[PDB]
Amino acid sequence: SSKEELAPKLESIMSEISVCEGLVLAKNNGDVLIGQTLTEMDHNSIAKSVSKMFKTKIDALNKGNLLEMTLGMDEGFLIAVKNNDLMVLGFLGPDGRSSVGLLLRQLKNIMK
Amino acid sequence: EELAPKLESIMSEISVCEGLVLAKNNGDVLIGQTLTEMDHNSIAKSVSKMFKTKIDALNKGNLLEMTLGMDEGFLIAVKNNDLMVLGFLGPDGRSSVGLLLRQLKNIMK
């Protein structure tokens, strides 16, 4: 199963990137498969929101579908990478800008 | 007035940048400069509505910047209280994503 294959990969990312606050795997429709977070978080609601952002049509841009998102927030970052079936979401704290590129690269690798 | 020569400067410095759009946070376009004809207003409206996405469950406050990876390139957007700036890159421009974001953040104060 996807949960079984990706779970150790996500856990390895959490331990290598100690500043990562959580990694959540969901179907592209937002249904959460597995999650690990350093705080109590509503994974389901977050994944529903990110699912809807991935569906944004910016048709006048003619660049096709959205495949990855890096969101800079007041208190940190969300990185999201999707393939044709799943999407993975990662969270970084406010000082985490220096790990954004690393996290995005690791998630793209496992979702290729 | 003070931002229009800055957009020109960014475009002259980053050749892979396909365009810049300065808009109000509601999506009304102030200035748009793209290498090809594009409906700047429709793009700004789409991005404006994206910036309004509610993600309070993230517990990270307001959404301030977006870097969007697309099939055919990238869209970078940065907002402040009043304005929003958009930049477009082709697939040949991932090496310039950080630079373009850094420049857009600089001019949005």
- Looking at domain A2-111, its CATH architecture is 2-Layer Sandwich (3.30)
DSSP 8-state symbol, B56: G
Of residues A2, A74, A57, the one with CA closest to residue A33: A2
Q: Do A72 and B64 count as a contact with CB atoms less than 8 A apart?
A: yes
For residue A73, the chain B residues in CB contact (below 8 A) are: 55, 58, 60-64
Q: Which residue has the tokens 């990110």?
A: A50
Compute how many other C-beta atoms are within 10 angstroms of the C-beta atom of residue A10: 23
CATH topology of domain B4-107: Beta-Lactamase (3.30.450)
Q: Do B61 and A75 count as a contact with CB atoms less than 8 A apart?
A: yes
Query: Dihedrals φ, ψ of B51, to 5°?
Result: -65, -15
Residues 6+ apart with CB under 8 A from B15: none
Name the token pair of A81: 């990478």
Name the token pair of A65: 């579908």
How far, CA to CA in Å, does B99 sit from each of A95, A107, B87, B91, B96?
19, 22, 11, 15, 5
Residues A104 and A89 sit within 8 Å (Cβ to Cβ) = no
Of residues B48, B55, B91, B97, the one with CA closest to residue A78: B55
Q: What per-residue string of b and e applies to B1-33 under the rule 16 or more CB within 10 Å gives b?
A: eeeeebbeebbeebebbbbbbbbebebebbebb
What DSSP assignment string belongs to A10-78?
HHHHHHHSTTEEEEEEEETTS-EEEEEESS---HHHHHHHHHHHHT---GGG----EEEEEEEETTEEE
Residues A73 and B64 sit within 8 Å (Cβ to Cβ) = yes
For residue B37, the chain A residues in CB contact (below 8 A) are: none
The shortest CB-CB distance from A69 to any of B39, B47, B68 is to: B68
Q: Rounded to an integer, what distance in angstroms lies between the CA atom of residue B18 and that of residue B90?
A: 7
How far, CA to CA in Å, does A55 sit from each of A48, A50, A51, B70, B109?
11, 9, 7, 12, 30
